Design a protein around this nucleic acid. Structure first.
Ligand SMILES: O=c1ccc2ncc(=O)n3c2n1C[C@H]3CN1CCC(NCc2cc3c(cn2)OCCC3)CC1
Ligand SMILES: [Mn+2]
Ligand code: NA
Lengths: 481, 190, 473, 189
DNA sequence: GAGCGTACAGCTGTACGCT
DNA sequence: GAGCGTACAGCTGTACGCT
């Protein structure tokens, strides 16, 4: 019939904008993932593509993810997966990929038909206890599948790997961090709810990029930690070595995060070709698999290498700023957060996961105890049980007779009818008793956790500590003060 | 690109703008080729509220629309030279389809405003729940969306020109703040 | 060092042979090229049957690409698309949802948008595949298993035809009418010394999905006798100043392209009398191309000669027989298929008998256990381990290892009243079934009749009217 | 188009690796010794210069890129002394489609750059297993590209007459002679 | 500045046989 | 002739926010 152009534009643009904000471009505060990444990692989990298992074809993964979880282009899915496997993009890679997954020179990965992928070992920690009712599941786009709303994420993934995302009306740009630092920070926070950002920074020095390099100063870091917004200068690792006859050369071995190496060299050569910079004689990318990143800039005899190097920082991506803008989803809404907020939201997420996991374990263990109690009754009075079943004309009658005679529940009665004859042998009765005895031990341990929040919080601590010891590594990015 | 219709009489003719060949195939098979033309675009079109004029005129997708409508642009625009009396926006029933619709309406508002004023610009209502229009069969797409007897087109009405000027400038304009403000003012999460 | 002649000959022979035996040519048994067989087997493994809902095309292609077909996604998808088009496949093998292309050469919607499942009749290609009827082979990487041939309970090669460009050779087989083919196979099964002329009483000629006309029986006969021949496919056109209406076009003719050539004719002043050329074709209306005449028979005859309104189908029946490319006539094609059916049904029976006998053996053990249950329990109860219990059951009751195993795996709920009557009833049915299967394995004629019956059932369920009219004169 | 040259300019020690695409090319660029090893990824099945007319051959993009990379020219205008590399390595996939691309490249080399073969600059690399587009940089370097460990097969022209006949028969426009060759030599087993 | 990274979308060569 | 149908291969245009 009729539709006002103003109403249409406002409605349609808000529809798109909100969707990009909440369901595309911005990561969750709890697991640090976007929809596409969480659907890739969940997809890997469902098809049992674990580190111990062999690589699977990338086309099969992207097809499974596209079909079940992500009703979007293959390009957007595949390219997302490739990033999580790149050791130059991801500080803690979440995907293990075999084949050509791209280089720092910005050549793309091989088409998905050549490559194979699987989980990394730390990705198991993202997904640990996902099947234990720790997180809520929601319908998928078509409603024929279920998908997680958030992963348990047993390590602080938002701050570890960081994120960048161009949304609508806003964006996010969060630098990666060191896992040993972050967990130490979370442990500190857990011991002091009224801890300062200042004190948190004793654990968390600043960003830690997979590409190492150098951070200039700590004032940039402090501001971004305090307000969620700040500018951190990333510098290449370059040295000047004398060459004899007064000659010098600049050797670059580490470049700023998210900088394309080939493109950076092109820029340098562009400045030399246009004579925008003075004193450079030769430019060679001697990067090899043996040496790693290596860029050699030869320098004329008369020219001062220090001046040339400083000029290269100003004029090229040799020095680059990372503009921190810490917008994550909190309770389904875009929020500019500070370092403490992000850690706090995560800790609360862990507490819930651990509390829900314990509740689930207690539910299952008590169910299993109920069953074992029924089996214990059955094996202790087996002669009576046999007779009761044999005198029964149908399975239904046997059900009722067992419940009446032995004061059994319906579930107990079913388990007895489902019992194999091999269970009547000597070893099995001791097996049921031993299983039931240690179960009672387990039930009380879980109750102790649910009885005291102090016990539960220590459990969170200890699990993070185990994840720190196993997956923690050295700082790569040197912060020069 | 254009799959034109047989009738060369603009008053009874309608053109459908679809997102591409995937939707274009369904549309071409389902259509009444006597009076229904089809122009498949190629994903997100240019935001004419942001782009420079030089880029707009050289834009291939923009050019194909101007050529299809046969009116021209701006001052050169002649409504009498329109070869279609119904320009129907038929984007996919998703959030990106809603975006492409805003981009198209932006072009129509800024370059071919008389089309909107004459009431030549319509919005199709495809059934919700389908991934794309290419996900639909031609028979179902024809009956529910394209057949004049059963379809439900929305005629785009410009009621307030000054309000519209501000609406387009805020949503589609170069300044992010105005957009972020609108989003904060209006966004419904729960 | 490496001789250039040696390298050229060996590297080219590798490609040529591969293309021939594993790309471009269909097997004579099931009429499938590798990519088609891999698509259909994928659908079956993932349980994408007609009763189940449509599955995302991208998810099928990724599954096929990952396990079976180490080739491009477009190669797989376009192949799957074609099996779902009622204008390409005389008996479509894929059931497609969304845009799957038209007669005008418009391709299908990107695979992110389409959904697919098996057709009813594809189930018949795969029927009995888990009954040791066909030989399985390692996939390309050795992580998966795939079939070398499908059981193909209907003659798919001739029904659906095939065109493939190989190396050194090619294939072009037209589709046929299912009823006619099965009738033809039934005839053959009764008369091995049957002639082509006799076979043509059942199989009148090709049957294109796009219907239309065939000019004469001469082209058909020569193609059926030698494996090669020209068959004239003519559009269905009627005359009604006057206008010509085309309702059916020849097979594999692009409708839009054909119209363009008619318009190109009149523009070049190559033909006389045409005033207007319109395509009024809609899905509801069907194919309708109208050619208006200046104030018509001579013009229509002229169009047949000068446009693809009449197109030749150059028949060239090359297929893989025993893993080798062979030019075959009609009889060879039916012989090779029937011999495949005879093997399929034989192997299925062997499997079935083997399965039934294994089961009837288990049931014997259960009967003894249920008949003497008081003793069974005590023997089990007095045992310390499962192994001891296994030995005790075998010794005391003269049971096999499998029988004793099945007794220990028996649930307590099977001690109930009706259970004993349920075991004996199943057992009596087995004994008769075992008997039926042995009769089939012991008499060639009984096996051959079983093939006849099963073929006839598919004919009665899926057989349809002929679409293409064969005009004599 | 997409050539990654070696830094050195001394052809006697330089080598160019011809690969099938960017999938293979990417891995190859990572793993190579960028001092002496160049990489030219083509865009798949290259034109058959035996069947194709000279107009099309000279118009072809991958053909043009190869001509430019070698710097020798074609025919009588061809000069051996102007070779940019003294090792032109055909590194085809592994698979049967690779073998085909191999025969298409040797057809081009024989017909347009025969003295390149004669001099012994043309080689065939042997990937270790399926395609080499699925290989890591370290894996590809050690197995195929490392002059310490690699096994390159030098193409040698023995009988010119016999080689002229081989190309005409296999790659020529007459199907029959090619069908015949297949019939005579194919062992299906 | 321009490109970061998830989104939308699609095209053109090449081989090979026949007719 | 040019296209039928399985194979090989890859690139460009759009949105969006930020420093
Ligand atoms: O449309 C065009 C136009 C030009 C062009 N140039 C270069 C180029 O690479 N491309 C160009 N294009 C397109 C694209 C080629 N395209 C072919 C399909 C392929 N699809 C990969 C894929 C998809 C899926 C798979 C596997 N592989 O299985 C799971 C589900 C879907 C991606 C690359
Ligand atoms: Mn769309
Ligand atoms: Na040297």
């Amino acid at each position: 019939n009729e539709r006002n152009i103003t109403s249409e534009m406002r409605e349609s643009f808000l529809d798109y904008a909100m969707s990009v904000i909440v369901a595309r471009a911005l990561p969750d505060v709890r697991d640090g993932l976007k929809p596409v990444h969480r659907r890739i990692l969940y997809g890997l989990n469902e098809q049992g593509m674990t580190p111990d298992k062999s690589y699977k074809k990338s086309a099969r993964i992207v097809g499974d993810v596209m079909g079940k979880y992500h009703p979007h282009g293959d390009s957007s899915i595949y390219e997302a997966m490739v990033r999580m496997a790149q050791d130059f993009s991801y500080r803690y890679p979440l995907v293990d990929g075999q084949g050509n997954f791209g280089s720092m020179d910005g050549d793309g990965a091989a088409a998905m038909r050549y490559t194979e992928a699987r989980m990394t070992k730390i990705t198991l920690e993202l997904l640990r206890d996902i099947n234990k009712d720790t997180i809520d599941f929601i319908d998928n786009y078509d409603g024929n599948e279920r998908e997680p709303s958030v992963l348990p994420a047993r390590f602080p993934n938002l701050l570890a790997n960081g994120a960048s995302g161009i949304a609508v009306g806003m964006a996010t740009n969060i630098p990666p961090h060191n896992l040993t630092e972050l967990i130490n920070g979370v442990l500190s926070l857990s011991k002091n709810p009224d801890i300062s950002i200042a004190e948190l920074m004793e654990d968390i020095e600043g960003p830690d990029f997979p590409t190492a390099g150098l951070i200039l100063g700590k004032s940039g870091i402090r501001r971004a930690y305090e307000t969620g917004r700040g500018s951190i200068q990333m510098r290449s690792r370059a040295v000047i070595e004398e060459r004899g006859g007064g000659r010098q050369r600049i050797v670059v071995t580490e470049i700023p995060f998210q900088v394309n190496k080939a493109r950076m060299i092109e820029k340098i050569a562009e400045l030399v070709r246009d004579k925008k910079i003075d004193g450079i004689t030769d430019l060679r990318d001697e990067t090899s698999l043996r040496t790693g990143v290596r860029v050699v800039i030869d320098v004329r005899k008369d020219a001062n290498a220090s001046v040339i190097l400083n000029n290269l920082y100003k004029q090229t991506p040799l020095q680059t700023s990372f503009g921190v803008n810490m917008i994550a989803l909190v309770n389904g809404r875009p929020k500019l957060i500070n370092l403490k907020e992000a850690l706090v939201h995560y800790l609360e997420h862990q507490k819930t996961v651990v509390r829900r996991r314990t509740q689930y374990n207690l539910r299952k263990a008590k169910d299993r105890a109920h069953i074992l109690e029924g089996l214990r009754i059955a094996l202790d009075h087996i002669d009576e049980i046999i007779s009761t079943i044999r005198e029964s004309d149908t399975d239904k009658v046997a059900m009722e007779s067992l419940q009446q005679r032995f004061k059994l529940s319906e579930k107990q009665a079913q388990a007895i009818l489902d019992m194999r004859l091999r269970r009547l042998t000597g070893l099995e009765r001791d097996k049921i008793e031993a299983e039931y005895n240690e179960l009672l031990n387990y039930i009380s341990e879980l109750e102790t956790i649910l009885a005291d929040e102090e016990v539960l919080l220590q459990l969170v601590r200890d699990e993070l500590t185990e994840i720190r010891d196993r997956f923690g590594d050295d700082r790569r990015t040197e912060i020069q003060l | 690109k254009l799959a034109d219709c047989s009738s060369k009489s603009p008053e009874e003719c309608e053109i459908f703008l679809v997102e591409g060949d995937s939707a274009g195939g369904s549309t071409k098979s389902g259509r009444d080729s006597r009076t229904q033309a089809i122009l498949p675009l190629r994903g997100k079109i240019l935001n004419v509220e942001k782009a420079r004029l030089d880029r707009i005129l050289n834009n291939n997708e923009i050019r194909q629309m101007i050529t299809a409508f046969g009116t021209g642009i701006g001052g050169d625009f002649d409504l009498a030279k329109a070869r279609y009396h119904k320009i129907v926006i038929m984007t996919d029933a998703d959030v990106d389809g809603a975006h492409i619709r805003t981009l198209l309406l932006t072009f129509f508002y800024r370059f071919m405003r008389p089309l909107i004023e004459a009431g030549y610009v319509y919005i199709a209502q495809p059934p919700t729940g389908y991934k794309g229009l290419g996900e639909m069969n031609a028979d179902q797409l024809w009956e529910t969306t394209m057949n004049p007897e059963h379809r439900a087109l929305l005629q785009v009405k410009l009621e307030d020109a000054i309000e519209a000027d501000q609406t387009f400038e805020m949503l589609m304009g170069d300044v992010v703040e105005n957009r972020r403000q609108f989003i904060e003012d209006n966004a419904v999460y729960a």
